[PDB]
Amino acid sequence: GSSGSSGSHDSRLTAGVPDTPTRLVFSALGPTSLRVSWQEPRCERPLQGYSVEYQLLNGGELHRLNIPNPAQTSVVVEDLLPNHSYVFRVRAQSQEGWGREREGVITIESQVSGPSSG
């Protein structure tokens, strides 16, 4: 219909940003090793990379991991503490900016051989 509007100049706002990614996948290669994998979220613009921030659930040191590859949807986290929870918050970045991030905490469990058939 008719044209013409009035108001702030909010149009270039971050819209092509990557939507919150899906749950994460932990491998736990070991007591001091792990592997977080996410799912390429929706984004009108091509992603430039990813960010995997992890830190003691309770509250300790926060380590930010940058991904120079927008295709690599998986990273191996090592140098962790045994029997300690870590909040792994994965985030995505696109030509626009940083979108949402998925929360995923893991509990290092050593000396566990699953169930026992009998």
Q: How was this structure determined?
A: NMR
CATH code that applies to domain 14-118? 2.60.40.10
For the four alpha carbons of 23, 29, 30 and 35, in that order, the dihedral sign comes to negative
Structure token pair of residue 31: 């007591």
Structure token pair of residue 91: 């985030």
Taking the C-alpha atoms of residue 35 and residue 116, their distance in angstroms, rounded to an integer, is 26
Tokens 């979220």 belong to 41
Domain ranges of the chain: 14-118
- CB crowding 59-71: b at 16 or more within 10 Å, else e: eeeeeeeebeebe
Beta strands 62-67 and 47-55, pairing class:
antiparallel
Q: Supply the DSSP string of 22-83, one letter for each residue.
A: ---EE---BTTEEEEE------SS-EEEEEEEEEBSSS--EEEEEES-TT--EEEEES--TT
